[PDB]
Amino acid sequence: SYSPTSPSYS
Amino acid sequence: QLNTLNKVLKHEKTPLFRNQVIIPLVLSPDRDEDLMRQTEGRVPVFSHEVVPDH
């Protein structure tokens, strides 16, 4: 869950 | 006035502040409408960037 977000979290 | 008051408060038989250590429990990229209200608009949705930054 919540991996570091390069593109924003969907 | 504000600076003198702050220094005075920090040095009047108050707990030792170097003792305590601030640790974050949970980070969720979820939208939060309560932290946005509580911090008066700045720092919404406690993400990953915000803990190294603050």
Binding site: - | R18, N19, Q20, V21, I22, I23, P24, L25, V26, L27, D34, L35, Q38, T39, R42, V43, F46, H54
Partner: protein
């Protein structure tokens, strides 16, 4: 002045986030800021001087 206000506000935000246990902590790890020098005296002197 804007920048000073922003730093003040950030500190206040962190303090308000410690005000509660919401996504935060306050465990007091029994430590001791040990300064191995006479930093205090010198610091005070120079500061007062300038």
């Amino acid at each position: 002045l804007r920048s000073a206000l922003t730093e003040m506000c950030v500190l206040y935000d962190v303090l308000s986030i410690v005000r509660d246990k919401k996504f935060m902590t306050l465990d007091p790890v029994s430590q001791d800021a040990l300064p191995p020098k006479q930093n205090p005296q010198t610091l005070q002197l120079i500061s007062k001087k300038k």
